[PDB]
Amino acid sequence: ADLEDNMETLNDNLKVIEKADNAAQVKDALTKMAAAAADAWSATPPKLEDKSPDSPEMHDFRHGFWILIGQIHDALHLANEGKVKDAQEAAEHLKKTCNHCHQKYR
Amino acid sequence: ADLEDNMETLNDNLKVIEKADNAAQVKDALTKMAAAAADAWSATPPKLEDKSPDSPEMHDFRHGFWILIGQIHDALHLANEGKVKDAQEAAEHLKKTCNHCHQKYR
Amino acid sequence: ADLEDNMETLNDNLKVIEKADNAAQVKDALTKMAAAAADAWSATPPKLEDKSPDSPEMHDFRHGFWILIGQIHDALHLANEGKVKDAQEAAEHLKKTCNHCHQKYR
Amino acid sequence: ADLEDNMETLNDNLKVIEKADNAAQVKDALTKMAAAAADAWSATPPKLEDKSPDSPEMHDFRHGFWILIGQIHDALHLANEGKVKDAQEAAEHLKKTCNHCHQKYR
Ligand code: HEC
Ligand code: HEC
Ligand code: HEC
Ligand code: HEC
Ligand SMILES: [Cl-]
Ligand SMILES: [Cl-]
Ligand SMILES: [Cl-]
Ligand SMILES: [Cl-]
Ligand SMILES: [Cl-]
Ligand SMILES: [Cl-]
Ligand SMILES: [Cl-]
Ligand SMILES: [Cl-]
Ligand SMILES: [Zn+2]
Ligand SMILES: [Zn+2]
Ligand SMILES: [Zn+2]
Ligand SMILES: [Zn+2]
Ligand SMILES: [Zn+2]
Numbered sequence: 001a002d003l004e005d006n007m008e009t010l011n012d013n014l015k016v017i018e019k020a021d022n023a024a025q026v027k028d029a030l031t032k033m034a035a036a037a038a039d040a041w042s043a044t045p046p047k048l049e050d051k052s053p054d055s056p057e058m059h060d061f062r063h064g065f066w067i068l069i070g071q072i073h074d075a076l077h078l079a080n081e082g083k084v085k086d087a088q089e090a091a092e093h094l095k096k097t098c099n100h101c102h103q104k105y106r
Numbered sequence: 107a108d109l110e111d112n113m114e115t116l117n118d119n120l121k122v123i124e125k126a127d128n129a130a131q132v133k134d135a136l137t138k139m140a141a142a143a144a145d146a147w148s149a150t151p152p153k154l155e156d157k158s159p160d161s162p163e164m165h166d167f168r169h170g171f172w173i174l175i176g177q178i179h180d181a182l183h184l185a186n187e188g189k190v191k192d193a194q195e196a197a198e199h200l201k202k203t204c205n206h207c208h209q210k211y212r
Numbered sequence: 213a214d215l216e217d218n219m220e221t222l223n224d225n226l227k228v229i230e231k232a233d234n235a236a237q238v239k240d241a242l243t244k245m246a247a248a249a250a251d252a253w254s255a256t257p258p259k260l261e262d263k264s265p266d267s268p269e270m271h272d273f274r275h276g277f278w279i280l281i282g283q284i285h286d287a288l289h290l291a292n293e294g295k296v297k298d299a300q301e302a303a304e305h306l307k308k309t310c311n312h313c314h315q316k317y318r
Numbered sequence: 319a320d321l322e323d324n325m326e327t328l329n330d331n332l333k334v335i336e337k338a339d340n341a342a343q344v345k346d347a348l349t350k351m352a353a354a355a356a357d358a359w360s361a362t363p364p365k366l367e368d369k370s371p372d373s374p375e376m377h378d379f380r381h382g383f384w385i386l387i388g389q390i391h392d393a394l395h396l397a398n399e400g401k402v403k404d405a406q407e408a409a410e411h412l413k414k415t416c417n418h419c420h421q422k423y424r
């Protein structure tokens with residue numbers, strides 16, 4: 001998928017996790033979010049099309065996806081230990097990473 | 107130090123980071139925060155004085171400090187990389203971790 | 213790219229890191245490794261072609277790539293910090309992750 | 319405890335984890351190792367007594383304890399998801415961090 005399809009995957013599943021009921025629903029949305037972050041890691045955002053692929057802005061862009069993957073990694077370990085409430089609550093951590101990247105690059 | 111003392115070190119140095127005007131003030135405040143979080147790791151908070159050292163509650167409490175130490179680790183790399191504004195902005199990430207432990211265990 | 217291609221990118225760039233003589237060769241090889249690990253994240257390896265996408269086996273396989281991405285993240289911060297020899301030495305950490313996945317899933 | 323008492327705690331429990339049988343035995347040794355790493359984070363090793371507390375050697379010293387705490391964090395999530403074999407095997411990851419610090423500072 002392109003970067004916008006990955007953003008739509010992240011937006012949708014972040015909501016499937018706010019409104020979540022059962023466990024394998026939080027587990028499955030975090031898995032789809034991790035797939036979308038990893039897939040998006042290599043993309044160039046439109047605001048940076050004109051920049052060197054190894055410009056400080058593209059280095060910082062890719063770093064935001066490392067932070068988000070690190071957060072989905074911990075939340076999925078919480079969800080897989082039966083701590084499903086604490087995994088939902090990890091949403092508030094994620095949104096903050098969503099907003100930091102959007103502030104500079106969307 | 108006791109948990110109350112470590113928290114005041116966290117609170118003070120987080121204020122230093124938000125208001126800092128040079129790179130050395132941010133690095134130094136991040137190192138002091140890491141020392142306080144590491145020291146707090148061993149503490150039993152008041153609401154859990156009755157629970158055992160290896161209870162689920164005390165397991166989950168200590169996990170909160172690993173998250174915080176993880177964030178300070180990343181912010182200090184940003185700071186030692188020249189990316190000092192980005193290190194300052196990691197303060198917004200830390201507060202979420204501060205609030206989350208407070209909501210559950212304070 | 214396919215899993216075989218991503219592995220050859222991992223193998224080649226790991227060799228570049230061990231034999232590199234300037235900072236730019238280490239950074240560039242670490243970024244290429246991160247791109248290949250992120251791309252490999254989606255793959256199904258041969259020994260697990262019969263297992264489902266959300267099987268325990270495929271969960272554990274993907275976890276191996278999070279570990280590797282985590283290590284490359286840390287090594288690149290060491291490299292962008294001036295600590296280039298320490299970034300080169302992180303290669304010894306990566307190989308352990310390479311061997312561990314190979315022992316279980318290759 | 320001082321730095322040598324923490325090293326003896328890490329050495330002992332790393333062995334309790336090679337020879338481990340049950341689960342709460344691997345869980346309890348990883349917990350004691352995490353306590354010892356956090357406690358040791360603030361110490362000054364004898365080889366660096368003569369160095370600035372914020373010298374590159376003391377910064378790199380404390381960084382080794384971040385890496386080890388990060389590894390114990392992941393292994394304890396593996397042990398707490400019933401993946402007790404994969405948690406034992408995390409020993410090989412840890413030993414490599416033991417050796418890197420010892421190479422420069424013990
Ligand atoms: C950078 C490291 C980012 C992170 C982390 C997240 N997003 Fe993002 N997002 C980013 C960019 C550069 C863009 C713009 C892309 C473009 O082609 O214009 C976006 C866009 C979105 C959108 C809008 C999609 C659309 O229909 O145009 C959404 C709804 C969105 N992003 C959601 C989102 C969520 C929920 C995130 C975290 C969970 C998140 N993004 C992280 C860059 C980055
Ligand atoms: C748990 C994992 C915590 C994290 C992370 C942080 N704090 Fe904390 N804090 C915690 C507890 C259990 C308590 C109560 C301790 C007691 O014995 O009374 C506190 C207390 C504080 C306080 C002041 C005391 C109060 O209001 O009762 C402050 C100012 C404070 N904490 C700040 C703080 C900051 C800034 C943090 C992150 C950077 C932070 N805390 C993290 C538990 C935990
Ligand atoms: C799983 C999480 C893996 C990690 C991490 C690494 N590798 Fe890998 N590698 C993996 C599989 C399943 C396979 C077999 C793929 C197939 O379809 O045949 C491989 C294969 C290789 C190969 C060559 C192929 C072979 O011997 O069959 C190489 C050279 C290789 N991998 C190198 C490599 C390196 C250097 C890694 C870390 C830096 C690494 N791999 C990580 C699964 C996984
Ligand atoms: C630095 C970041 C270190 C890490 C990670 C680990 N160790 Fe260590 N260890 C370190 C120092 C500086 C020293 C010397 C301290 C001194 O006062 O001389 C040590 C020492 C040991 C020892 C010897 C203890 C003794 O009786 O003198 C042991 C047995 C030991 N360390 C074990 C150990 C293990 C098992 C580790 C990881 C699991 C480990 N250490 C990590 C510095 C660092
Ligand atoms: Cl990660
Ligand atoms: Cl998980
Ligand atoms: Cl525990
Ligand atoms: Cl750095
Ligand atoms: Cl899964
Ligand atoms: Cl850095
Ligand atoms: Cl950690
Ligand atoms: Cl855990
Ligand atoms: Zn965790
Ligand atoms: Zn898992
Ligand atoms: Zn951020
Ligand atoms: Zn004060
Ligand atoms: Zn980082």
Ligand SMILES: [Zn+2]
Nearest residue numbers: 183186293377
């Ligand atoms: Zn550093």
Ligand SMILES: [Zn+2]
Nearest residue numbers: 090093203206
């Ligand atoms: Zn939280």
Ligand SMILES: [Zn+2]
Nearest residue numbers: 220221223224
């Ligand atoms: Zn090749």
Ligand SMILES: [Zn+2]
Nearest residue numbers: 179183286289
């Ligand atoms: Zn680091």
Ligand SMILES: [Zn+2]
Nearest residue numbers: 059187289292
């Ligand atoms: Zn960087």
Ligand SMILES: [Zn+2]
Nearest residue numbers: 309312408411
């Ligand atoms: Zn491993």
Ligand SMILES: [Zn+2]
Nearest residue numbers: 073077392395
């Ligand atoms: Zn993990």
Ligand SMILES: [Zn+2]
Nearest residue numbers: 081169395398
């Ligand atoms: Zn846990």
Ligand SMILES: [Zn+2]
Nearest residue numbers: 302305415418
């Ligand atoms: Zn190392």
